Amino acid sequence: KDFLPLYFGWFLTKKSSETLRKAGQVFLEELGNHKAFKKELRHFISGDKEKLELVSYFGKRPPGVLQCTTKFCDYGKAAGAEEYAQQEVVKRSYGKAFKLSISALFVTPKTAGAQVVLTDQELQLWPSDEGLPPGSRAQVTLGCAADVQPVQTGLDLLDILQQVKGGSQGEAVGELPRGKLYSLGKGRWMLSLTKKMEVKAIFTGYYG
C-alpha cells in the first residue's frame, strides 16, 4: 500500500496566487483604516498607539502559493482519507487545471480568507465527511492570528454564511473599490465583491 498526500487541494498558479494575495493585503489595509472598523475595535481584540495594523495581526500567512484544500489525509491517517483518494473523480482530476470563483473576502479575530464558490464538477472533488449547502466551507486562507490553525478559516466562513442566511448581514457600513463592506459583529467582516475574482489552479496532492 502506497501512502497518500498530506492533503489534496487546488493549488493556485504563481500569477493567480500573487493576484489574490495582493488583493487580500489591500483589503486588510483598507479594512484596518475604515471608520466602521475602528469603532468596533473592542469587539475585535480584548487588548487595549491607537491603530491596529491587520497585516501585522494576521502574522501567520501561507509561505508558498495560495490553495483551496479539499481533503486533509495526513498520509492516510485521517478518517476517510483512503476512501476519498480512491474515488475515480479524484484520480481522474489529479493534475488537472480548474478555475475557482472568489465571491468575497472576510476577516475575523482568528482568520482572513477568500470565499470560494465551487462549480458542480468541482463539488465532485469536495469530500462528504447544518443548513448550508455542501461546499459552503470552501475557502483560500490568507492569514491567521498567532495561535490559530488552518482548519479555523473554513469554520469562520460557515459562521459568517449563517449570519448572512439569517438576514443579520445588515446594510453595508462602507464601500470599497472592490465591493460593499459588511459588519456582522463579534469582529466579523465581509467584502462582497462586485465582480467575482477568477483564479487558475491545479488539483493535486501536497506531501510536505
Residue numbers in the entry: 162 to 209, 212 to 292, 300 to 378
Provide passages from the article that reported this PDB entry.
In mouse CNPase, this is done by His230, Thr232, His309, and Thr311, in a manner, where a nucleophilic water molecule activated by His309 can attack the cyclic phosphate and a pentavalent transition state is formed. Mutation of active-site histidine residues (H230Q, H230S, H309Q, H309S, and H230Q/H309Q double mutant) abolishes CNPase activity. Overall, the structures of H230S, H309S, H230Q, H309Q, and H230Q/H309Q are highly similar. However, only H230S and H309S could be used to trap nucleotide ligands within the active site, whereas H309Q and the H230Q/H309Q double mutant could not. The results indicate that all the variants were correctly folded and heat-stable, with the largest destabilization, 8–9 °C, caused by the H230Q/H309Q double mutation. The catalytic motif, thus, is also important for CNPase stability.
